[PDB]
């Protein structure tokens, strides 16, 4: 029982269980009437009314594991309607933040804790956060290029939130889940939910692309494989619910994670194309047929490599022709029209295959003049006019193991007009690393010769993305969205003033 509450006189009992249902018990005849699903579990509830117009209640959002995100809800008790709903923006992090404690229950899972495990897990997390040199907090955050909303991918859910008004405007599920069909209790709690992991937009904004993985239950024959599903959605320019238009089971053979997804430029098909690359080396170009109604394979290239990189990336020229396919450590440049390596008649040492030092994290092109590559130790800026490196920057002080391979993508972003944005993050030590954090931001030019601007921020920064209207937005660990960018009169007042 996570919340108990009494009515004002002493005849009704508000009960606050885990199962997502708030129950009113009329004591006198001993009967119950209850509200069934409330978007999570209810930590708190009570009655505020002068007679009882309003219930106040506080939600946990227990589906999110890494960061306990609470939400305030105020219910008119006549209809039991949601007279007021307040919530801050909801991210999800790779790893759990500084000292949050998942609530108590009856059993243990990866979403809850029993009592002994609760205390021991508090101590365990604090000790591991001091000890382990791996941690990162790298989330994916999107921007609506015609609505300027932020699309936070929750697990099995999406939060559309704008920061001009600082108020949540939509919440949705996008997954064949168990999202509202039943509040989970014990073994249903040990069950895990299908996770959205990749979400991107087409540049026209009228085609949303997403990619969610789904897990099996425990201890069955088919609990060995996972299942990846690709999805294409639309919406109009005025609605605020997304309609699913194409769902694809198991891209790239079976049980193969789609690893990197890419929204095509305007020039190809009015931004109606996407690139999907698996973890072995394949490329696929899907798009939208308009004499069909749908999305299809436009082109493939599937080598059968029996080595696997967890870390891939790819980028696309603005004239729709040069596809920079970055596998681990050995980039390629391909012509789009055949998906094969750029075979030159000139052969002037701007050859299609490149080798760098270590595993490549993120490539971009700032224009068709410079390719910007980030590996696991350094950052390099290379020309396209000539097959030769230009600028080098040492980073193996900072990016040591502090990022799981593939997340500097959601660190580094850039404008398309001036420069690129680099990130450094350091935990503020004492003499032993303490819990607290600190962050440094660099603003580079296209040549990467001079830092166009340096900045410091006193807390851990998770993600910087670029606004299409030429600025930068960023998410902080304490979820504070910040920006980097450019007679008569006296009588009049008295009239407004107005047992035997």
């Amino acid at each position: 029982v996570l919340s108990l509450s009494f009515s004002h006189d002493g005849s009704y009992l508000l009960s606050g269980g885990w199962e997502k249902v708030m129950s009113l018990w009329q004591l006198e005849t001993n009967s119950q009437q209850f509200l069934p699903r409330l978007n999570g579990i209810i930590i708190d509830c009570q009655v505020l009314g002068p007679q009882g117009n309003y219930y106040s209640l506080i939600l946990q959002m227990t589906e999110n594991n890494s960061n306990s995100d609470y939400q305030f809800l105020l219910l008119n008790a006549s209809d039991l309607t949601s007279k007021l709903s307040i919530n801050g923006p909801l991210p999800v992090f790779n790893s759990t933040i500084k000292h949050i404690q998942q609530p108590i229950s009856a059993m243990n899972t990866k979403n809850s804790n029993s009592i002994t495990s609760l205390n021991h897990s508090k101590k365990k997390q604090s000790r591991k956060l001091i000890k382990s040199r791996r941690q990162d907090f790298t989330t994916n955050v999107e921007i609506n290029p015609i609505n300027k909303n932020l699309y936070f991918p929750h697990i099995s859910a999406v939060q559309i939130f704008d920061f001009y008004k600082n108020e949540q405007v939509n919440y949705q599920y996008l997954t064949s889940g168990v999202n509202n069909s039943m509040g989970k209790v014990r073994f249903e709690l040990n069950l895990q939910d299908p996770i959205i992991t990749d979400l991107k937009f087409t540049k026209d904004g009228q085609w949303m692309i997403t990619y969610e993985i789904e897990y099996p239950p425990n201890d069955l024959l088919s609990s060995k494989d996972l299942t990846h599903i690709l999805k294409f959605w639309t919406k109009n320019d005025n609605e605020t619910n997304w309609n699913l238009k194409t769902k694809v089971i198991n891209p790239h053979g079976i049980s193969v994670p789609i690893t990197k997804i890419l929204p095509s430029p305007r020039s190809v098909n009015n931004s109606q194309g996407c690139l999907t690359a698996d973890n072995n080396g394949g490329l696929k170009f899907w798009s939208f047929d308009s004499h069909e109604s749908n999305w299809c394979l436009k082109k493939i290239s599937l080598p059968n490599f029996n080595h696997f990189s967890n870390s891939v990336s790819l980028a696309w020229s603005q004239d729709g022709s040069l596809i920079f396919h970055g596998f681990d450590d050995k980039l390629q440049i391909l012509d789009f029209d055949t998906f094969k390596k750029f075979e030159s008649l000139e052969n002037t040492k701007t050859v299609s295959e490149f080798t760098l030092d270590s595993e490549i994290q993120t490539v971009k092109l700032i224009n068709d003049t410079n390719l910007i590559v980030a590996t696991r130790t350094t950052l390099n800026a290379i020309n396209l006019l000539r097959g030769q490196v230009i600028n080098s920057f040492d980073l193996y002080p900072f990016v040591n193991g502090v990022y799981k391979n593939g997340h500097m993508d959601r660190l580094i972003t850039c404008d398309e007009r001036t420069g690129n944005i680099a990130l450094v993050i350091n935990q503020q030590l004492t003499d032993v690393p303490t819990i607290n954090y600190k962050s440094r931001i660099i603003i580079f030019d296209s040549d990467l010769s001079t830092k166009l601007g340096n900045f410091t921020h006193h807390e851990y920064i998770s993600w910087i993305g670029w606004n299409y209207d030429t600025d930068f937005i960023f998410l902080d660990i304490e979820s504070t969205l910040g920006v980097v960018g450019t007679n008569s009169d006296i009588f009049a007042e008295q009239l407004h003033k107005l047992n035997d």
């Binding site: 708190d44 002068p50 309003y54 506080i58 709903s85 404690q101 600082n166 969205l481 920006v483 960018g485």
Partner: protein, 184 residues
Amino acid sequence: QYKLSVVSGGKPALNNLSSVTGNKNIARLSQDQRNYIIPFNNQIKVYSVETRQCVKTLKFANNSLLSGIFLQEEENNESIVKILLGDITVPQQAHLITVFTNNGHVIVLNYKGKLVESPKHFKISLADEKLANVFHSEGNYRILTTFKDNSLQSYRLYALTFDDAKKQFEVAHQAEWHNVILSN
């Protein structure tokens, strides 16, 4: 040229540090029940109910006194823990608010208007133990606080009024309980 700013607030600021109280709710309905006050993480928000809309966002940052108190960039140990409606100083005043923090600061602000940068600020003494709760009857107010000398907390209950001189707060020992487990 390039400027950095904090724009949108996040988390709605629970009473997690206590975790022994059974009523974590801090937000409060006003006297006139048209509006609702939410203590956030970096600001305090005013909502008007019948339009479901935010109206005034009292940010901690623009106010120097709050920014000199609430965003202390070595620790945010000080956090809001209680909200009271009217004016603690003198009774029968309108659109006012008293904010009660984790460490002995007591502020009076005034929503519904251009908030003047003159926050009515006072400090309640004996802050070797940190504030646990504040509540009230008519005029006679009570304070719960958290003391220690087995990995638990002792609770002290104190009685409270105002104005010996302006700053001198009449906190007096009422009672003490030794080691709480769960409370409401």
